[PDB]
């Protein structure tokens, strides 16, 4: 069942369950019990080999200073230069709204910590390519430069 969670996450087929409860039977001392699991893992392998195919690649660079500076004006647009250097100096504040704000940490140990929040919904990365190239887009890595 740990290999089955790994499968249901490398692919998105949360519905597909292969391990059945019937592998063990106390009437017959549970004899042969492992060979059903061996068959079930051979199915889990062969269905992966058929379903799984080469996923294409992109590297997109995303600048947070442009994401917040370009913020739709129904939230207050701001460049990080003029809020970092006053939320350093003052113990509280915020700019923007919702998932796209910048603010002091909420939790009791974070109150000295400054956090910058953004949503992928504003990155709008699904607009980078035609839909028929492929219906799902998944992160393989994220990295930072400061």
């Amino acid at each position: 069942l740990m290999a089955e969670q790994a499968y249901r996450w490398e692919l998105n087929d949360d519905s597909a369950r292969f391990i059945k409860p019937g592998a063990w039977q106390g009437t017959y001392a549970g004899l042969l019990a492992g060979e059903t699991l061996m068959l079930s893992l051979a199915q889990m392998e062969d269905a992966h080999l058929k379903r799984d195919k080469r996923a294409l690649e992109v590297e997109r660079t995303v600048s947070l200073a442009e994401v917040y500076a370009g913020l739709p004006k129904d939230n207050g647009p701001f460049s990080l230069a003029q809020e970092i250097d006053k939320l350093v100096s003052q113990g509280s504040g915020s700019a923007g709204s919702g998932n796209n704000n910048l603010a002091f940490g909420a939790g009791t140990d974070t109150k000295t910590s400054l956090q910058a929040s953004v949503s992928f919904a504003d990155l709008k990365i699904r607009e980078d390519y035609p839909a028929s190239l492929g219906k799902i887009r998944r992160i393989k890595q994220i990295s930072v430069t400061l």
Partner: protein, 293 residues
């Protein structure tokens, strides 16, 4: 079912002969009357048993995830039924399932599709619960076990049992009806199995030629080590006389009933140590009747 109080004299004589014949057969077979009643019984006990519960668990676990269009349900279900009900061969279980589907056992006519749907929906393995349809399931399972008791007691070979299940007309059962496990059918099945055993090593070719419409006087005569002219003349004499069911050249060796009639003619001829024309002359001596001269 017929009552002795209101019965014809000829019917009573026929009843006496049937009782005597069945008793003689049971004595030859070393069978108790209770065993015959069990093999010929129709009422089934509607009580869950540990064996039936194990059968249900095994079938439910094996058939989970089955797809209807991918393969036939009966063929997929046969091996687990064979494993649970103590059968030697898988194809014997397949033939038994076909026969059970034709009989539709029990008070609630049960079949593979209905059984599979009930197992899929209303069954929770490992728990003792009361289900309204559970009695019909138990009756169906009991019928399957009884049809095993038939197959093992008769001693017939696997492929002739398959043929009997698939084409009762070849065995002369009433056309268009599922074969009966009535004692009347049991005695003829036992005689067929004994005749196949008597053919010995030739049986492999004789049965194959019998399953096709291929068998002839010469091949069967070679198989039984009899004179070919004897079988040809026995067939001619059988055709001339009025049997019921009638014997015609295009069924004389195709159906098992015609073969049985011809072999009875041959046996009576060899008992009297005369040719079949002797028996033909004998049966003409109906001197105590008004039907004919």
């Amino acid at each position: 079912k017929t009552n002795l109080s209101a019965i014809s004299d000829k019917q009573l004589a026929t009843l006496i002969r049937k009782l005597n014949t069945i008793t003689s057969w049971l004595h030859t077979q070393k069978w108790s009357v209770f065993q015959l009643f069990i093999m010929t019984s129709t009422s089934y006990n509607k009580t869950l048993t540990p064996e039936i519960k194990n059968l249900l668990d095994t079938v439910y676990h094996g058939l989970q995830g089955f797809d209807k269009d991918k393969a036939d349900l009966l063929h997929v279900m046969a091996p687990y039924i064979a494993a649970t009900l103590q059968l030697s061969s898988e194809n014997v279980a397949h033939s038994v399932l076909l026969w059970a589907d034709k009989l539709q056992p029990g008070d609630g006519a049960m079949t593979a599709e209905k059984f599979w749907d009930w197992l899929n929906t209303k069954y929770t393995p490992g728990s003792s619960e009361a289900v309204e349809t559970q009695e019909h399931i138990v009756q169906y399972c009991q019928a399957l076990a009884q049809l095993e008791m038939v197959y093992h007691s008769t001693g017939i070979n696997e492929n002739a049992f398959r043929l009997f299940v698939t084409k009762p007309e070849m065995f002369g059962a009433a056309t268009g009806a599922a074969p009966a496990h009535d004692a009347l059918s049991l005695i003829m099945l036992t005689r067929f199995a004994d005749w196949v055993n008597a053919l010995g090593e030739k049986a492999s070719s004789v049965l194959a030629a019998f399953e096709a419409n291929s068998l002839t006087a010469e091949q069967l005569a070679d198989a039984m080590n009899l004179d070919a002219n004897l079988l040809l003349q026995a067939s001619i004499q059988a055709q001339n006389h009025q049997h019921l069911p009638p014997v015609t050249p295009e069924n004389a060796f195709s159906s098992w009933t015609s073969i049985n009639t011809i072999l009875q003619w041959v046996n009576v001829a060899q008992q009297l140590n005369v040719a079949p024309q002797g028996v033909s002359a004998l049966v003409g001596l109906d001197y105590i009747q008004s039907m004919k001269e």
